[PDB]
Design a protein around this ligand. Structure first.
Ligand SMILES: CCCCCCCCCCCCCCCC(=O)O[C@H](COC(=O)CCCCCCC[C@@H](C)CCCCCCCCC)COP(=O)(O)O[C@H]1[C@H](O)[C@H](O)[C@H](O)[C@@H](O)[C@@H]1O
Lengths: 55, 54
């Protein structure tokens, strides 16, 4: 019963569990985690990111 | 507690230099090209201007 409950709970919750620190967002310094990177992170070295006003 | 990194009284700074962006190596596989033409020479393309002065 303990093993079955362990397996079932883990299989129930592992779908939800995700790594926050999986490098996914590309960056000039290689793929990085989402929290480190924002829209201002240069995708490639020397990229121009204008401070565009949102009309 | 205060955050480890704060405050800088010295080193007033400098005016940022004029930004000179670089062509995208990642987004563009190669170099973006403008006018298209046969250009049976070293290469001139489909864009050629000139200003005739006095
Ligand atoms: C007694 C059980 C002992 C085992 C505990 C297991 C929990 C520790 C994990 C150990 C292996 C970790 C390394 C290998 C695995 C790894 O690399 O994955 C990581 C995340 O660990 C997972 O996988 C899923 C975690 C499993 C759920 C754990 C639930 C908590 C346990 C402690 C509570 C139930 C146990 C019974 C006790 C309570 C009794 C009740 C009275 C990161 O995710 P990621 O790299 O983004 O890929 C994503 C894919 O994983 C993800 O499934 C998928 O959803 C995608 O979204 C994907 O993004």
């Amino acid at each position: 019963l303990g093993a079955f409950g362990a397996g079932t709970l883990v299989a129930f919750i592992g779908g939800l569990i995700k790594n926050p620190w999986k490098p996914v967002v590309p960056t000039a310094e290689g793929k990085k985690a989402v929290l480190w990177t924002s829209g201002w992170t240069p995708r490639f070295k020397g990229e121009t990111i204008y401070l565009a006003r949102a009309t | 507690c205060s955050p480890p990194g704060e405050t800088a009284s010295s080193e007033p700074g400098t005016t940022p230099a004029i930004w000179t962006g670089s062509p995208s190596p990642a987004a563009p596989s190669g170099e973006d090209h403008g006018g298209g033409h046969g250009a049976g020479a070293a290469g001139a393309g489909e864009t050629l201007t000139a200003e005739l002065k006095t």
